Amino acid sequence: HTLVWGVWVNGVDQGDGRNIYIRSPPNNNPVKNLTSPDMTCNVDNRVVPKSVPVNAGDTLTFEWYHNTRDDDIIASSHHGPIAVYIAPAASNGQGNVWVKLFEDAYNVTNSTWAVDRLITAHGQHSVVVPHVAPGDYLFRAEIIALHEADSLYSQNPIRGAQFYISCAQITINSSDDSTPLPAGVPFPGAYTDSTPGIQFNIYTTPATSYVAPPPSVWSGALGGSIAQVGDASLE
Ligand SMILES: *[C@@H]1O[C@H](CO)[C@@H](O)[C@H](O)[C@H]1NC(C)=O
Ligand SMILES: [Cl-]
Ligand SMILES: [Cl-]
Ligand SMILES: [Cl-]
Ligand SMILES: [Cl-]
Ligand SMILES: [Cl-]
Ligand SMILES: [Cl-]
Ligand SMILES: [Cl-]
Ligand SMILES: [Cl-]
Ligand SMILES: [Cl-]
Ligand SMILES: [Cl-]
Ligand SMILES: [Cl-]
Ligand SMILES: [Cl-]
Ligand SMILES: [Cl-]
Ligand SMILES: [Cu+2]
Secondary structure (H helix, E strand, O other): OOEEEEEEEOOEEOOOOEOOOEOOOOOOOOEOOOOOOHHHHOOOOOOOOOOEEEOOOOEEEEEEEOOOOOOOOOOOOOOOOEEEEEEEHHHOOOOOOEEEEEEEOEEOOOOEEHHHHHHHOOOEEEEEOOOOOOEEEEEEEEEEEOOOOOOOOOOOOOOOOEEEEEEEEEEEOOOOOOOOOOOOEOOOOOOOOOOOOOOOOOOOOOHHHOOOOOOOOOOOOOOEEEOOOOOHHHO
16 A cells, blocks of 8 residues: 655655645555556546646656655555556547556565565655657556465455556656657556466565566666655655
């Protein structure tokens, strides 16, 4: 159970984004139904009043929390990967529009899932804003918690992969548009019962054999990290 508080741009807190520039759901409950429209931007997908301005090459940091800002972030049980996708805002997240900018599943060196490193990072993970056309975009941050993913939700609705999905409204002001955004995947629809990384037993299978769901990261993406950029306790 986890939610996005807001974003930072180049290490500068943009302030409380909840129902302002984040299409916030009412609570921190997971989505589990792979075919539901809730897979797009969670259960309350509507236009919110503001869009954070960035430029191509800026560092955009998402900040997650559990109950209050900079708390335990997410329960330690919730091992799993983190991805970030982008789509043109005009789409409203419908159609074949989502392009993957970032993927982190399991780091063999540190023996940590992306979620474990997100806790250590005070809920902060970043992407570098790609060189797409100037305009309005939705950035979709997705955590998959795998602690009950040995079962499929479609077969047993009390278990299944848990999806924590947040969509931020971002406006790209300056960009040279050197990497125009290609077509992407649909949410719902990219993930099915047979997609790799949706059904997995973290208790009995070694993390080193985990494969994150496709699509692969777009070659136009400029990277990202799971790492604290700012200290929320100074604001
Ligand atoms: C999943 O959501 C879809 C689309 O709204 C709906 O048809 C179906 O009843 C749900 N599946 C389960 C397993 O609850
Ligand atoms: Cl929880
Ligand atoms: Cl509810
Ligand atoms: Cl659901
Ligand atoms: Cl605005
Ligand atoms: Cl726990
Ligand atoms: Cl540029
Ligand atoms: Cl579907
Ligand atoms: Cl498995
Ligand atoms: Cl992977
Ligand atoms: Cl590509
Ligand atoms: Cl980064
Ligand atoms: Cl860190
Ligand atoms: Cl700081
Ligand atoms: Cu939870």
